Amino acid sequence: DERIVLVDNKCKCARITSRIIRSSEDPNEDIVERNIRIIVPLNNRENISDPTSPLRTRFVYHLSDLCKKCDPTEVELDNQIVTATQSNICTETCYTYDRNKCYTAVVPLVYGGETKMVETALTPDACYP
């Protein structure tokens, strides 16, 4: 209740919260706190959509490209309504999987000579077809 969520990334599992604590009583001596929580996977591979990819042992977390806003907002100017660009900075790699997303693959299946490629489910359960 006393914390405000800024970003809730799922691919990098990054979550940032900010909070002001009323330390002492002088209004000019209150500290501003920034919390970062990162969960890293140790079993996932380089490309989450290809099981043959090698393992990944290097993780990079840029905070300038995480707390960024990229959706035009509406602004009232007393004579019209316009769309405004939040940031000008606006291929990112997905470290972990997303529950709200489904991951599938193509695999050759041989039986009596004939080969039937069928869609698989890399994720354990995720969504249903």
Binding site: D71, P72, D78, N79, I81, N100, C102, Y128
Partner: protein, 216 residues
């Protein structure tokens, strides 16, 4: 002073765009009051029910055949007030229309929704009208609360919680994914009254669509 019987917005594409035409007693004329802010345009749009005012401007008169006379009173309206009847007007007098310019107003297309692909309606894929195009709604966040809001608007009764076993009978879509991350908390009256991301921005695929089955 005359009381406006209605507005018609003639000489424009459809009836949500054109020139402001106040209905004077008997014969009606065009109005070019000064200080025409968006607040008066909002009341004008609400008169017709088109939707939200988006733009208002005065255009140069280059042989536009402005035969319609001009009014002789102002219509200072707070915008949040009611129909043109309930907003103060000056006591007749002279006109503020010095430069001969017509007043323009641009309302928006009204909202609509339907279910496509289900038998006898009340079931199927969700399509929402906006900008004169129908499109699909993403299922990234589709709780049970977001299901009942659509059902009562079309009068299909309370949803019976059909799960996803029978949601494969409608298939995917081909239209643009207009809405995403829809979160409806209360009943409200319409889906647009909820909190969404934006019109045209999504991170979904036509495979992941929303299927709603009400009681019928």
């Amino acid at each position: 002073s005359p009381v406006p019987e209605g507005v018609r917005l003639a000489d424009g594409p459809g009836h949500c765009k054109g020139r402001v035409e106040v209905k004077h007693q008997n014969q009606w004329y065009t109005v070019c009051q000064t200080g025409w802010s968006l607040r008066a345009a909002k009341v004008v749009c609400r008169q017709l029910g088109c939707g939200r005012a988006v733009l208002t401007q005065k255009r140069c008169n280059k042989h536009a055949y402005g035969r319609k006379p001009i009014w002789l009173s102002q219509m200072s309206c707070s915008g949040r007030e009611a129909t043109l009847q309930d907003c103060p007007s000056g006591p007749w007098g002279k006109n503020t229309c010095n430069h001969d310019e017509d007043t323009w107003v641009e309302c928006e297309d009204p909202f609509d929704l339907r279910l496509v692909g289900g038998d006898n309606l009340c079931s199927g894929r969700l399509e929402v009208l906006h900008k004169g195009v129908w499109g699909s709604v993403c299922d990234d966040n589709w709780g049970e609360k977001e299901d009942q809001v659509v059902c009562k608007q079309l009068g299909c009764g309370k949803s019976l919680s059909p799960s996803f076993r029978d949601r494969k009978c409608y298939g995917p879509g081909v239209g643009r994914i207009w809405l995403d991350n829809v979160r409806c908390s209360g009943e409200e009256q319409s889906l647009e009254q909820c909190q969404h991301r934006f019109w045209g921005f999504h991170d979904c695929t036509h495979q992941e669509d929303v299927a709603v089955i009400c009681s019928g």
